[PDB]
Write a protein that binds this DNA or RNA. Structure first.
Ligand SMILES: [Mg+2]
Ligand SMILES: [Mg+2]
Ligand SMILES: [Mg+2]
Ligand SMILES: [Mg+2]
Ligand SMILES: [Mg+2]
Ligand SMILES: [Mg+2]
Ligand SMILES: [Mg+2]
Ligand SMILES: [Mg+2]
Ligand SMILES: [Mg+2]
Ligand SMILES: [Mg+2]
Ligand SMILES: [Mg+2]
Ligand SMILES: [Mg+2]
Ligand SMILES: [Mg+2]
Ligand SMILES: [Mg+2]
Ligand SMILES: [Mg+2]
Ligand SMILES: [Mg+2]
Ligand SMILES: [Mg+2]
Ligand SMILES: [Mg+2]
Ligand SMILES: [Mg+2]
Ligand SMILES: [Mg+2]
Ligand SMILES: [Mg+2]
Ligand SMILES: [Mg+2]
Ligand SMILES: [Mg+2]
Ligand SMILES: [Mg+2]
Ligand SMILES: [Mg+2]
Ligand SMILES: [Mg+2]
Ligand SMILES: [Mg+2]
Ligand SMILES: [Mg+2]
Ligand SMILES: [Mg+2]
Ligand SMILES: [Mg+2]
Ligand SMILES: [Mg+2]
Ligand SMILES: [Mg+2]
Ligand SMILES: [Mg+2]
Ligand SMILES: [Mg+2]
Ligand SMILES: [Mg+2]
Ligand SMILES: [Mg+2]
Ligand SMILES: [Mg+2]
Ligand SMILES: [Mg+2]
Ligand SMILES: [Mg+2]
Ligand SMILES: [Mg+2]
Ligand SMILES: [Mg+2]
Ligand SMILES: [Mg+2]
Ligand SMILES: [Mg+2]
Ligand SMILES: [Mg+2]
Ligand SMILES: [Mg+2]
Ligand SMILES: [Mg+2]
Ligand SMILES: [Mg+2]
Ligand SMILES: [Mg+2]
Ligand SMILES: [Mg+2]
Ligand SMILES: [Mg+2]
Ligand SMILES: [Mg+2]
Ligand SMILES: [Mg+2]
Ligand SMILES: [Mg+2]
Ligand SMILES: [Mg+2]
Ligand SMILES: [Mg+2]
Ligand SMILES: [Mg+2]
Ligand SMILES: [Mg+2]
Lengths: 25, 142, 99, 108, 58, 129
RNA sequence: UCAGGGUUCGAUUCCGGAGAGGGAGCCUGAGAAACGGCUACCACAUCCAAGGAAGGCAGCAGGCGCGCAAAUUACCCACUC
RNA sequence: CCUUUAACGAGGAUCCAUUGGAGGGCAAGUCUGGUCGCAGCAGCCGCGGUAAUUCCAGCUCCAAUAGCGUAUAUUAAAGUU
RNA sequence: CGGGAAACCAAAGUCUUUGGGUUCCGGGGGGAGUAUGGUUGCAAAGCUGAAACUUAAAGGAAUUGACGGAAGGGCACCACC
RNA sequence: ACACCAUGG
């Protein structure tokens, strides 16, 4: 797959970034 | 496969068309305003600027050259833009730190031809044309 | 583009059918999309039947058959030459091959 | 090397290769490290870096592999950029170093 | 090849100069149209089916 | 669920003339359809027709000749004002030498070449050409 | 601009409205919340003998500034009023 | 100022027509000289690597013509609202 | 029958001879179902959802080749036994 | 009645 894994990678990066943002504030 | 046809449906038709216009790119950028706010001109045809320096940009393959551009900073906005110089050997008329009047290229927002990411071109260097500076009809004021 | 009118499957007028495992691949295919085969064969082989019928204890003995029902995934059914790919219009024959 | 491609005209480089010296706005350099997109870093024989570009005449024709003597043309108005005009054989590189052409600075 | 490869105005400089040779003042206005009608419609000396263009050279 | 009865009648007659039939059955029916078929018959586009009683809405059997080419309905009965009539018979009709717009007016169900004669507009029903 | 339907524009000589740097208050008059009127605050700016006084071109010309972008500091009540 | 009029005022080498093009779309050269994937052209497809109908110039030819080219907003083409 | 770009469809027909009724929804390719605001959820996440910027194509059905660690026939000591 | 077979100025 490449749509599936693109979606998965974007999801995991979004989780990391959301955690960083909301832990900063 | 279905579009209301009845005799009192005018509200639905009008309110639905008014919505669907917003998916048409060319209409959308006329009316959101975020294009005009982002335009490096003022929403004008031309702008004056001061020549920061001279660069060459390598053209996009297959064809090959170095395309002889100024990099200008505009007077009114103060924002920085790159511009092409339009004929054989003109890059010698452009001294550094004089004014220039840049114009559009020809496709209203987009880089023309083989040059990567240059959207404007020079017409006047110091209140004299390039077409006259190059055809010999005038010489630089200094 | 679409390749089969029935999608290569029997299901019409139904939502779901319970799966079934292949017999060599152990894959997991719908019971109507799998490739079935009934096999009825002698418990002895045809070479041996004249030797075994010679040392029976009894005078009349008709040896037993082996009834087995097989299901194949498509990859395994094509790898074992059970079915073959066919011409484009020759794909719409439903009658089984002549014996 | 070694492909199907006998389609391009054969090398024939055996005829009469000369020697080539500097000019106004030309100078020799050595290759430090190569980069993508075709362009490569360089290092001239006075100190400038001149992140250099392979001219259109040399595309997939003479292979500028790492760490060898090159000739670059400067630009009349920009200095941090240059373009490869020519690559030397190690024969020409020793010939220029002995002739008193390239400095006794860099090695081959 | 010699100098900067990027040398600007190369071909416009090294091109050899030639003057305008002419004297003859060309025609202007109605009198020019009078010319083009006569040359395109009045006398058209007949030719084979492989027709020819008004600036042909080859 | 059968909102427009004239639409079915005209589509039914039309789907059968193309096939080549000689008689067609229409069901339900109404005063409006019967008036419309009369206009289509005084001009010669269909033959005589027979109405069946059944103590409900009835049925009609129509005798077709081949002279008919199309008939149809304009689904919202828009108003037309005898100064906007030309913009209709120039969009709907195939040529200014034949074909008819049929419209309902205070003076009955008629065809535009007569509405012009009696100086009145009204609501558009359909056309046949 | 436009077959038919429409799309886009209307600061601009005719009609209506609103405002004289920003907000506010009033005198006189049939008529004004008037600025070619007055009073006060805000922001600007001029003269001084340092006590005081004076100001409003989005009228006509003209100048600076701004910008891709716009004319003369002329003549006259003879015509319309 | 225009109109009305005496006196001077035309031989074309001036009492001088320009602006953009010439591969296709799109009217007009498979001429000659120069440059050699450089300089450059080109709205789009594409031209230039030593034999360029596309670059620089001479010659010739094309379109409109006292006008023509470029940048930009907008309308028709758009039955792509 | 007729329709369609065709594969194909008794509906995907009765459509330039265009109008039976009504609901959702598309507008070159990417950035992107991303950023941000709201909201629901214990959480994983769902729903609603941009722009800057970049690009001359990305795509659909069908045709002829070439290839296949795809299938059926057949052939050669420049193939094997 | 299936060992291993990547890449291309
Ligand atoms: Mg959308
Ligand atoms: Mg875009
Ligand atoms: Mg497939
Ligand atoms: Mg059922
Ligand atoms: Mg169902
Ligand atoms: Mg399901
Ligand atoms: Mg109109
Ligand atoms: Mg107005
Ligand atoms: Mg305004
Ligand atoms: Mg004004
Ligand atoms: Mg007014
Ligand atoms: Mg009033
Ligand atoms: Mg002011
Ligand atoms: Mg008074
Ligand atoms: Mg006041
Ligand atoms: Mg006043
Ligand atoms: Mg006063
Ligand atoms: Mg005062
Ligand atoms: Mg005043
Ligand atoms: Mg003034
Ligand atoms: Mg200025
Ligand atoms: Mg102006
Ligand atoms: Mg000015
Ligand atoms: Mg007077
Ligand atoms: Mg010319
Ligand atoms: Mg040209
Ligand atoms: Mg030429
Ligand atoms: Mg052309
Ligand atoms: Mg032509
Ligand atoms: Mg040569
Ligand atoms: Mg040549
Ligand atoms: Mg030539
Ligand atoms: Mg439009
Ligand atoms: Mg559009
Ligand atoms: Mg059937
Ligand atoms: Mg049926
Ligand atoms: Mg059936
Ligand atoms: Mg249908
Ligand atoms: Mg229909
Ligand atoms: Mg219908
Ligand atoms: Mg899109
Ligand atoms: Mg991409
Ligand atoms: Mg996307
Ligand atoms: Mg969505
Ligand atoms: Mg959020
Ligand atoms: Mg909500
Ligand atoms: Mg919450
Ligand atoms: Mg949306
Ligand atoms: Mg391209
Ligand atoms: Mg395909
Ligand atoms: Mg085989
Ligand atoms: Mg043999
Ligand atoms: Mg061998
Ligand atoms: Mg052997
Ligand atoms: Mg291999
Ligand atoms: Mg590798
Ligand atoms: Mg690789």
């Amino acid at each position: 797959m490449r749509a599936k894994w693109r979606k998965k990678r974007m999801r995991r990066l979004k989780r990391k970034r959301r955690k960083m943002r909301q832990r900063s504030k | 496969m279905g579009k209301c046809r009845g005799l009192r449906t005018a509200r639905k038709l009008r309110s639905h068309r008014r919505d669907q216009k917003w998916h048409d790119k060319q209409y959308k950028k006329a009316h959101l305003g975020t294009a005009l706010k982002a335009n490096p001109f003022g929403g004008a045809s031309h702008a004056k600027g001061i020549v920061l320096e001279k660069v060459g940009v390598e053209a996009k393959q297959p064809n090959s050259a170095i395309r002889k551009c100024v990099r200008v900073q505009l007077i009114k906005n103060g924002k920085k833009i790159t511009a092409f110089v339009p004929n054989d050997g003109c890059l010698n008329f452009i001294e550094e730190n004089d004014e220039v009047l840049v114009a559009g290229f020809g496709r209203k927002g987009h880089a023309v031809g083989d040059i990567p990411g240059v959207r404007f071109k020079v017409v006047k260097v110091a209140n004299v044309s390039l077409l006259a500076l190059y055809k010999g009809k005038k010489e630089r004021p200094r | 583009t679409k390749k089969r009118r029935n999608n290569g499957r029997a299901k019409k007028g139904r939502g779901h059918v319970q799966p079934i495992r292949c017999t060599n691949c152990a894959c997991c295919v719908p019971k109507d999309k799998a490739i079935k085969k009934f096999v009825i064969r002698n418990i002895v082989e045809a070479a041996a039947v004249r030797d075994i019928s010679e040392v029976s204890v009894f005078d009349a003995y008709v040896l037993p058959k082996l009834y087995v029902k097989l299901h194949y995934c498509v990859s395994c059914a094509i790898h074992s030459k059970v079915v073959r790919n066919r011409s484009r219009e020759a794909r719409k024959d439903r009658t089984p091959p002549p014996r | 090397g070694g492909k199907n491609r006998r389609r391009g005209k054969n090398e024939n480089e055996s005829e009469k290769r000369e020697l080539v010296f500097k000019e106004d706005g030309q100078e020799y350099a050595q290759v430090i490290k190569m980069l993508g997109n075709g362009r490569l870093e360089a290092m001239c024989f006075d100190g400038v870096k001149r992140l250099c570009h392979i001219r259109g005449k040399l595309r997939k024709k003479v292979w500028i592999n790492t760490s060898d003597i090159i000739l670059v043309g400067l630009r009349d108005y920009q200095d941090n950029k240059a373009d490869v005009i020519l690559k030397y054989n190690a024969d020409e590189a020793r010939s220029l170093k002995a002739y008193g052409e390239l400095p006794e600075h860099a090695k081959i | 090849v010699h100098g900067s490869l990027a040398r600007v105005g190369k071909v416009r400089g090294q091109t050899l100069k030639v003057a305008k040779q002419e004297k003859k003042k060309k025609r202007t206005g109605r009198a020019k149209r009078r010319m083009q009608y006569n040359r395109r419609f009045v006398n058209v000396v007949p030719t084979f089916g492989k027709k020819k263009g008004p600036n042909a050279n080859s | 669920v059968r909102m427009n009865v004239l639409a079915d009648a005209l589509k039914s007659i039309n789907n059968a003339e193309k096939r080549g039939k000689r008689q067609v059955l229409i069901r339900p029916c109404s005063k409006v359809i019967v008036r419309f078929l009369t206009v289509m018959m005084k001009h010669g586009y269909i033959g005589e027709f027979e109405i069946i009683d059944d103590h409900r809405a009835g049925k009609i059997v129509v005798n077709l000749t081949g002279r008919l080419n199309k008939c149809g309905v304009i689904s919202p009965r828009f108003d037309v004002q005898l100064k906007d009539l030309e913009k209709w018979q120039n969009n709907l009709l195939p040529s200014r030498q034949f074909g008819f717009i049929v419209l309902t007016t205070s003076a009955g169900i008629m065809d535009h070449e007569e509405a012009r004669r009696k100086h009145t507009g009204g609501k558009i029903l359909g056309f046949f050409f």
